[PDB]
UniProtKB/TrEMBL annotation:
Gene behind the chain: polA
Name of the protein this chain belongs to: DNA polymerase I
Biological-process GO terms, alphabetical: DNA-templated DNA replication; double-strand break repair
Domain (3'-5' exonuclease): residue spans on this chain: 4-170
Positions that bind Mn(2+) 1: D357, Y358, D534
Reaction(s) the record says it catalyses: DNA(n) + a 2'-deoxyribonucleoside 5'-triphosphate = DNA(n+1) + diphosphate
Full-protein residues shown: 300 to 878 of 878
Residues at which Mg(2+) 1 binds: D357, Y358, D534
Keywords of the record: DNA damage, DNA repair, DNA replication, DNA-binding, DNA-directed DNA polymerase, Exonuclease, Hydrolase, Metal-binding, Nuclease, Nucleotide-binding, Nucleotidyltransferase, Transferase
Summary of subunit composition and partner proteins: Single-chain monomer with multiple functions.
Chain sites annotated for binding dCTP 2: R319, Q360, I361, E362, H386, R406, K410, F414
Residues holding Mg(2+) 3: Y358, D534
Organism, as annotated: Geobacillus kaustophilus (strain HTA426)
Positions of CTP 1 binding: E173, D175, R176, L177
Residues holding CTP 2: R319, Q360, E362, H386, R406, K410, Y418
Domain DNA-directed DNA polymerase family A palm residues, every copy: 337-544
Amino acid sequence: KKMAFTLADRVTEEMLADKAALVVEVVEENYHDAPIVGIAVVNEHGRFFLRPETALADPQFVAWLGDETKKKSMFDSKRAAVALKWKGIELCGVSFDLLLAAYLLDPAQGVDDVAAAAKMKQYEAVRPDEAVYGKGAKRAVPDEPVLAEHLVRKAAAIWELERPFLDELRRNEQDRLLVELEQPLSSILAEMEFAGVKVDTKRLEQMGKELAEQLGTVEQRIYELAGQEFNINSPKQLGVILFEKLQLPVLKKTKTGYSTSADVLEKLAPYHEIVENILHYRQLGKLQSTYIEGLLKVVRPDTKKVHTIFNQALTQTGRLSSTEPNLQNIPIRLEEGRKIRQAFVPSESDWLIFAADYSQIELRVLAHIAEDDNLMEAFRRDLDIHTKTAMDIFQVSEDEVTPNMRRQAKAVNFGIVYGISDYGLAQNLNISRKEAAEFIERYFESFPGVKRYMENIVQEAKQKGYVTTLLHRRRYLPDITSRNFNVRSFAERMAMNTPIQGSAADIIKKAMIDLNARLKEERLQAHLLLQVHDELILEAPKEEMERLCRLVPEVMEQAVTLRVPLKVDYHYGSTWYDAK
DNA sequence: CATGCGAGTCAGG
DNA sequence: CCTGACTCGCATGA
Ligand SMILES: OC[C@@H]1O[C@](CO)(O[C@H]2O[C@H](CO)[C@@H](O)[C@H](O)[C@H]2O)[C@@H](O)[C@@H]1O
Ligand SMILES: OC[C@H]1O[C@@](CO)(O[C@H]2O[C@H](CO)[C@@H](O)[C@H](O)[C@H]2O)[C@H](O)[C@H]1O
Ligand SMILES: [Mg+2]
């Protein structure tokens, strides 16, 4: 049965009630400077559909949109807020976001549209967006009649589902997480995405030029060493050259054939000169295709900025993700790749990039949650945690710790967080299970509180069916009861890791909210540009750097109070590369 | 041919 | 281990 609604030709007062479900539809995946194809409003007076050209030109409607006292319930309000920012219109008063509500209730559900969130509460009187708009090449906005009914049905679903969702969040003790953390954060991410990051395209194009030269040279050397030309970028073709023509040993296989991953190649290097060259080719090729060409493809030519989109409702841990471009994985480990950061510059003359990052926030969080006396004391002394871990597991003094000892202790720490097992650490340390197991055993002997936490959290996940973070985010782990060792083991590692990675995500999100309020109170022009899991990147006038050096670290360090101090390091410079 | 996606790979925290 | 993007190449549609 069709849903009744008014297809309005003009805005009326009853459409501007102080409480309503609102839909501002942006069909394009990337909503930056994208079209708004329709608007739907559902409130106590009825259901309405408005053409965007009409609504967005109406002074009363625009005022209503920007009035914080007029409350709106939506799905993915960031999408609408950003689409509206590009049109110079402010969206305020969003008191409920169904996408974020659904995400907090169960990140694993993968809610990507109103229909999916609605199905969680047995509401199915709304179609999935994909069914209405089609996919990819066939994607298209349907005729007004079909479009209007769909938007009205989505607004109707939001109108009906708000209460049930808030009720469950309340029962889960997640009501404040939604209202005081995720929703306010959504507005901050919208501002960051809209601001964008300026790119020195001339710089990137030059790096690409010289990179192309080097690739050409290495490519030729590889053909020479192989005795023939082939597609180096083809694992299948490369596998034939290495394991058949050159007879290199096969130490690892993939589900489909020979493995040619960097890990395997490093072990084969001593057998043939072609290996080192392939690894070098892989490094430069990655930079060229992904960080030079790929980046240049998404830079807006009129502003020379990239406008990422942060997915706030995707990860099972509470972390954000970044797309088009992904600004959370720009090279930094190797110097050649790190230079790519010289292309990310301040958006204004005489401005600088400021970057602040938490020092070992995940391990500090673990010290707090597990209440491990040894680990807490370590951070209270602000010790080098890897050297300290080495001292304890190997039973040696500080000056007796060798570089390799610290390297292995660091690997244990890198893993301990991710609940890593004997077979997981072994690969990273290129050792055996029995040995790796003894390392973990030694770690627990030194950090008994951590061992107790790992045992207790797994039992809790089994008992409750989920684990939680410091700010009450949750993750259900149904596989925790599986009778399949591998499946159960993974769930166990997730039970151990989620409260750690998840609580660290909670902390930085809270820091972002606190920071934005502080920047406004101080009327600084400085603003957030990016978040990379445990670090915040801002840009500001050079005349604000000294103030930011004291302000940003303090706000980040004071976001939450743990049993151990939080420590933040910071740097600033002319480019993101220099902010080191 | 065009479109699209699983596999393999590798970048970050 | 949490993510996203790029290549290649078998697969399939309009
Ligand atoms: O001593 C703890 C005791 O063992 C428990 C099993 O009986 O088991 C937990 O840990 C093992 C791995 O060590 C997993 O295989 C089980 O699934 C997990 O429940 C627990 O029930 C009890 O407290
Ligand atoms: O939090 C984001 C929210 O949007 C969804 C809707 O399906 O993602 C859409 O937009 C992003 C950014 O452009 C794309 O990467 C996705 O492909 C597109 O579906 C996501 O599922 C939901 O959580
Ligand atoms: Mg750090």
